[PDB]
Amino acid sequence: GAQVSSQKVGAHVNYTTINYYKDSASNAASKLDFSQDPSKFTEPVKDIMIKTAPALN
Amino acid sequence: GAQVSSQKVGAHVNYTTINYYKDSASNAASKLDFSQDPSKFTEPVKDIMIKTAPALN
Amino acid sequence: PTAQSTPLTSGVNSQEVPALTAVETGASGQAVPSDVIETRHVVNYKTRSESTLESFFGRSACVTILEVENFNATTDADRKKQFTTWAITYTDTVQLRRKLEFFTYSRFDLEMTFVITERYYASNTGHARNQVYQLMYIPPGAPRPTAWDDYTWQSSSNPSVFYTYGSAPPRMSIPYVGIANAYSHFYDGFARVPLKDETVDSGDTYYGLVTINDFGTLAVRVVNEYNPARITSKIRVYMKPKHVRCWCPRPPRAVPYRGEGVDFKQDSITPLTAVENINTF
Amino acid sequence: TMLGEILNYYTHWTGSLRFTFLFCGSMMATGKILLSYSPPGAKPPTTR
Amino acid sequence: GYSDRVRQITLGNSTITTQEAANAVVAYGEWPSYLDDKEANPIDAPTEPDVSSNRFYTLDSVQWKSTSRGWWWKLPDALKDMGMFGQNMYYHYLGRSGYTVHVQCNASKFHQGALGVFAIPEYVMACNTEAKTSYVSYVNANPGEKGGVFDNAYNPSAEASEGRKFAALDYLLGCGVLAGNAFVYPHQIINLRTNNSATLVLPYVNSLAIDCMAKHNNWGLVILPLCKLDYAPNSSTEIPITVTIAPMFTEFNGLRNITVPATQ
Amino acid sequence: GYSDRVRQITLGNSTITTQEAANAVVAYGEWPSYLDDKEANPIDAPTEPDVSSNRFYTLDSVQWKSTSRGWWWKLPDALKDMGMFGQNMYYHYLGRSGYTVHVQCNASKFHQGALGVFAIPEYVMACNTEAKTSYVSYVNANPGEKGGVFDNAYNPSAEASEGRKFAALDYLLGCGVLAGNAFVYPHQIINLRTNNSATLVLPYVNSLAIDCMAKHNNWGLVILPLCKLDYAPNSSTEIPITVTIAPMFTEFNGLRNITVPATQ
Ligand SMILES: CC(=O)N[C@H]1[C@H]([C@H](O)[C@H](O)CO)O[C@@](O)(C(=O)O)C[C@@H]1O
Ligand SMILES: [Ca+2]
Ligand SMILES: [Ca+2]
Ligand SMILES: [Ca+2]
Ligand SMILES: [Ca+2]
Numbered sequence: 001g002a003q004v005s006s007q008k009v010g011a012h013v014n015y016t017t018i019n020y021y022k023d024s025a026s027n028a029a030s031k032l033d034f035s036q037d038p039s040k041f042t043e044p045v046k047d048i049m050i051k052t053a054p055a056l057n
Numbered sequence: 058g059a060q061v062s063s064q065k066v067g068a069h070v071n072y073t074t075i076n077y078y079k080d081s082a083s084n085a086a087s088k089l090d091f092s093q094d095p096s097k098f099t100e101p102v103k104d105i106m107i108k109t110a111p112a113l114n
Numbered sequence: 115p116t117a118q119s120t121p122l123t124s125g126v127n128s129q130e131v132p133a134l135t136a137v138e139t140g141a142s143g144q145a146v147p148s149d150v151i152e153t154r155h156v157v158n159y160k161t162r163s164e165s166t167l168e169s170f171f172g173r174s175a176c177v178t179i180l181e182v183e184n185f186n187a188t189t190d191a192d193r194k195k196q197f198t199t200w201a202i203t204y205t206d207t208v209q210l211r212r213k214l215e216f217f218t219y220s221r222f223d224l225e226m227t228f229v230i231t232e233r234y235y236a237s238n239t240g241h242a243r244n245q246v247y248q249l250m251y252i253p254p255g256a257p258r259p260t261a262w263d264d265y266t267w268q269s270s271s272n273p274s275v276f277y278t279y280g281s282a283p284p285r286m287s288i289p290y291v292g293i294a295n296a297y298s299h300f301y302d303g304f305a306r307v308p309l310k311d312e313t314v315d316s317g318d319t320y321y322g323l324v325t326i327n328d329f330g331t332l333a334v335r336v337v338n339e340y341n342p343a344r345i346t347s348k349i350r351v352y353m354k355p356k357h358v359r360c361w362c363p364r365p366p367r368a369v370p371y372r373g374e375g376v377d378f379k380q381d382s383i384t385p386l387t388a389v390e391n392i393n394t395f
Numbered sequence: 396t397m398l399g400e401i402l403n404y405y406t407h408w409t410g411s412l413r414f415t416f417l418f419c420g421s422m423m424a425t426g427k428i429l430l431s432y433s434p435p436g437a438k439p440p441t442t443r
Numbered sequence: 444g445y446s447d448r449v450r451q452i453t454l455g456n457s458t459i460t461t462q463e464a465a466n467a468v469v470a471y472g473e474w475p476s477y478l479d480d481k482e483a484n485p486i487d488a489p490t491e492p493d494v495s496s497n498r499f500y501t502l503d504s505v506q507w508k509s510t511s512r513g514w515w516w517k518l519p520d521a522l523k524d525m526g527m528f529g530q531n532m533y534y535h536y537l538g539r540s541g542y543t544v545h546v547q548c549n550a551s552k553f554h555q556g557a558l559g560v561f562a563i564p565e566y567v568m569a570c571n572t573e574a575k576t577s578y579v580s581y582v583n584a585n586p587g588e589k590g591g592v593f594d595n596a597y598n599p600s601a602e603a604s605e606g607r608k609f610a611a612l613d614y615l616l617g618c619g620v621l622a623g624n625a626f627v628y629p630h631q632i633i634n635l636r637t638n639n640s641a642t643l644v645l646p647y648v649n650s651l652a653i654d655c656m657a658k659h660n661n662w663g664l665v666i667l668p669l670c671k672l673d674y675a676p677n678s679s680t681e682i683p684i685t686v687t688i689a690p691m692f693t694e695f696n697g698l699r700n701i702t703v704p705a706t707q
Numbered sequence: 708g709y710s711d712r713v714r715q716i717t718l719g720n721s722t723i724t725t726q727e728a729a730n731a732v733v734a735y736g737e738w739p740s741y742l743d744d745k746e747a748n749p750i751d752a753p754t755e756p757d758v759s760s761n762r763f764y765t766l767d768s769v770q771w772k773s774t775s776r777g778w779w780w781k782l783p784d785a786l787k788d789m790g791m792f793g794q795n796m797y798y799h800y801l802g803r804s805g806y807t808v809h810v811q812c813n814a815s816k817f818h819q820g821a822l823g824v825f826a827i828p829e830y831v832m833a834c835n836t837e838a839k840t841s842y843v844s845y846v847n848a849n850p851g852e853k854g855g856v857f858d859n860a861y862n863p864s865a866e867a868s869e870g871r872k873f874a875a876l877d878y879l880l881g882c883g884v885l886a887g888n889a890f891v892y893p894h895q896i897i898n899l900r901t902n903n904s905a906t907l908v909l910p911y912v913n914s915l916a917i918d919c920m921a922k923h924n925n926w927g928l929v930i931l932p933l934c935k936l937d938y939a940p941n942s943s944t945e946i947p948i949t950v951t952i953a954p955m956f957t958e959f960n961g962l963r964n965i966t967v968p969a970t971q
């Protein structure tokens with residue numbers, strides 16, 4: 001049950017993971033999660049604000 | 058002869074087992090067995106008792 | 115997935131005014147350079163890999179230093195040096211605590227690692243055979259040791275690690291063990307409602323997470339009986355949050371901590387150094 | 396109790412508790428009895 | 444015709460109008476909602492009081508002066524004596540609620556000043572004694588609709604018994620962080636030249652589906668004068684700030700006799 | 708297995724059992740229900756408190772003696788201080804409710820006696836002065852869970868001010884009709900040799916869809932000893948009568964501040 005995944009690039013390929021333990025808590029770090037939605041903090045407004053339009057009309 | 062099984066969920070997949078020894082006594086813990094029949098202790102009665110019916114008719 | 119590339123843009127003369135906004139709305143400024151200057155095309159190959167929560171928290175941090183000793187104890191005080199108990203917390207140190215407290219709530223598994231060190235207390239009391247340590251996790255309710263060799267150390271159900279001095283730092287994983295759906299880093303409340311005209315003391319009660327938090331106890335002993343030479347030990351406890359989720363960001367701690375709460379210290383509430391002038395480069 | 400003894404090998408519990416009452420008076424004894432569970436945060440009940 | 448400045452909010456038998464709004468904030472982009480069966484915890488059929496409780500309650504007004512350092516409330520504490528919301532809160536062990544928070548402050552085209560209006564999850568504040576930590580009385584933590592005020596000085600008590608209140612130090616947001624960073628929390632600004640109101644819609648926020656409202660405040664409401672009130676004809680003028688809050692999607696579990704908290 | 712004598716009733720967090728019932732009455736053959744849109748009157752979204760209020764409340768017990776002439780209560784008056792039902796009743800101008808009434812009285816196979824248990828719509832009773840008509844104080848008309856007692860004598864007051872209570876004369880049902888005809892009202896009998904309980908399920912009954920609960924009692928509950936309590940070893944023995952009532956399909960309109968009726 002080997003997972004083959006992309007490595008993080010260095011100066012100049014893939015790596016293999018096998019989980020040895022029956023508990024997911026034993027696993028190595030979660031894979032890179034690039035998810036983001038800054039707008040829930042930077043723009044949590046009820047009515048859409050178009051950048052090119054006046055903020056207050 | 059690798060077994061791939063579900064891990065117990067953590068905060069936020071599968072794990073691999075290979076048995077290295079010729080005796081089953083050497084094996085790690087038995088897999089989770091959710092079997093149960095509380096009625097053999099909580100209701101070991103000869104005649105079926107329907108909850109909604111009188112216990113004694 | 116990469117950070118934003120810059121598009122090729124020239125000038126404008128337009129009723130479109132992306133440079134103006136109204137932050138009264140609760141929206142941050144949104145304008146980017148292409149809105150207010152002429153820009154070249156720049157392909158951005160750079161990523162935010164190292165600022166993901168897993169990357170930010172992906173370090174074993176020291177959270178406490180415990181002490182235990184091994185010698186022929188003839189007093190109550192010296193008997194209590196043969197083992198130690200520690201209420202598990204991240205508030206004995208400041209660095210991991212401050213990083214966690216960027217967030218209100220979290221969910222993670224924990225990697226715990228230990229670094230165990232010894233020194234001789236004295237010379238001319240001979241030597242000491244290599245020591246084995248027991249680190250026993252005592253969940254809330256399980257009996258706590260009152261002596262280094264009492265019955266509690268048989269540890270039939272509590273997890274224990276037996277560590278041999280000089281071996282690799284011992285390590286184990288702990289699941290997300292919270293009784294809520296996440297850990298609370300902050301709790302604006304009490305453990306119970308004090309009621310009208312009750313006789314229960316209201317003068318010496320506490321507030322916040324300290325009234326409700328209990329992650330149990332780490333108990334440590336040297337398993338060996340005493341040598342003629344007294345050995346003193348330090349156990350450094352390391353925590354790494356892994357498989358991390360966090361919610362509800364907070365301003366970070368700006369002034370020294372003075373305990374387990376958010377309290378501040380009167381002589382340490384001036385973090386800024388005054389500038390000579392508002393016009394100082 | 397058997398439930399209490401099992402719970403003292405665990406740190407956390409969840410779910411519903413069943414309290415069953417057996418009346419052991421004579422067959423000629425009658426009565427009505429109120430059995431109550433009051434979730435916490437108010438004056439503990441000392442009156443019906 | 445429709446404007447970011449002009450808004451009507453109706454909940455139950457109550458309506459708010461504003462003609463000088465600045466949009467509205469939905470905290471973390473999430474509207475409040477009822478608790479789904481797949482996230483539920485207590486198993487008793489909940490009370491959902493709907494229009495009896497999910498309506499605008501107007502708190503006692505406070506006076507903004509050139510010397511004001513700011514105001515705080517906790518929720519649901521500020522609404523604990525508000526009509527049927529208060530009754531449902533105290534008759535049940537468990538409750539959850541979202542809110543519409545409407546902060547009201549009008550002046551004139553000749554006045555100036557700016558209020559930061561922040562909704563803070565788990566707004567834990569410092570105590571006022573250095574003899575103890577986390578040493579705040581229930582009564583001082585839960586002032587109700589009167590809320591509390593910030594100070595620009597920290598004077599912790601000589602005796603532990605006299606310091607069992609919040610050290611609500613304005614520039615440390617009463618909790619050891621710099622007030623300039625409070626904008627990471629859901630917020631609006633009432634800048635008197637621009638707007639006369641702030642509207643924040645808050646979902647339930649907690650590490651649990653539902654909790655003990657009488658033990659635990661989910662939100663702090665902070666109003667800080669970021670720029671002091673100024674009025675050239677009278678520097679000593681006062682203008683009211685009025686706070687109006689509607690519970691939303693209220694749900695209660697664990698009915699029994701009424702909770703009557705200690706008042707001393 | 709199933710028996711007319713053995714019954715379980717569950718409403719909200721409350722359950723009743725009986726092993727010596729005599730069927731159950733559904734007054735006028737009609738189960739209670741919510742108010743249909745085609746019969747509605749007040750237009751505000753109603754409060755339907757459901758399990759918070761629609762549950763068994765047990766009144767203070769009364770003692771049946773060989774000399775007892777009987778007991779009366781009014782509904783919703785008897786439940787006005789009962790948990791969240793009372794709170795919903797007094798926070799609203801308007802309310803409607805059905806009821807499950809469970810009257811409890813056990814003895815032994817050696818005791819004898821029979822109680823008539825009657826649910827009376829608009830149970831208007833005579834006043835106790837002949838200087839006036841219809842001259843009863845609000846306080847005397849609305850005793851709450853303690854209810855009142857019947858007498859076998861009529862002694863109207865010398866002065867009008869002293870007679871502002873009911874003349875609850877047993878054989879005239881306190882209202883100028885013969886008690887033997889009370890069986891035209893929904894009823895059961897607790898005959899100690901047969902049964903230890905009476906169960907009556909009452910729909911809302913009125914000339915209106917919904918009404919002012921604090922002004923108007925929809926039902927009287929009357930318990931009359933038709934055959935006196937007798938017990939050969941002790942003629943002075945007393946056995947309790949316990950009244951347990953659950954509101955059902957409760958619906959309230961016209962929310963405002965709480966009604967606090969006069970107590971004198
Ligand atoms: C912890 C500590 O300071 N230990 C020191 C001891 C203690 O002072 C004992 O009391 C007396 O041996 O004294 C030494 O001279 C010794 O024994 O060689 C040096 C040693 O480092
Ligand atoms: Ca049964
Ligand atoms: Ca714009
Ligand atoms: Ca451009
Ligand atoms: Ca030892």
Ligand SMILES: [Ca+2]
Nearest residue numbers: 491755756757
């Ligand atoms: Ca409802």
Ligand SMILES: [Ca+2]
Nearest residue numbers: 491492493755
């Ligand atoms: Ca409802």
Ligand SMILES: [Cl-]
Nearest residue numbers: 231232233348
């Ligand atoms: Cl050391």
Ligand SMILES: [Cl-]
Nearest residue numbers: 263264267268
């Ligand atoms: Cl041992």
Ligand SMILES: [Cl-]
Nearest residue numbers: 291292293294
């Ligand atoms: Cl926990």
Ligand SMILES: [Cl-]
Nearest residue numbers: 388389390394
């Ligand atoms: Cl400088």
Ligand SMILES: [Cl-]
Nearest residue numbers: 524586587588
């Ligand atoms: Cl209040």
Ligand SMILES: [Cl-]
Nearest residue numbers: 788850851852
């Ligand atoms: Cl009453």
Ligand SMILES: [Mg+2]
Nearest residue numbers: 524525587588
């Ligand atoms: Mg009030």
Ligand SMILES: [Mg+2]
Nearest residue numbers: 788789851852
């Ligand atoms: Mg009462």
Ligand code: NA
Nearest residue numbers: 116117119158
């Ligand atoms: Na890019």
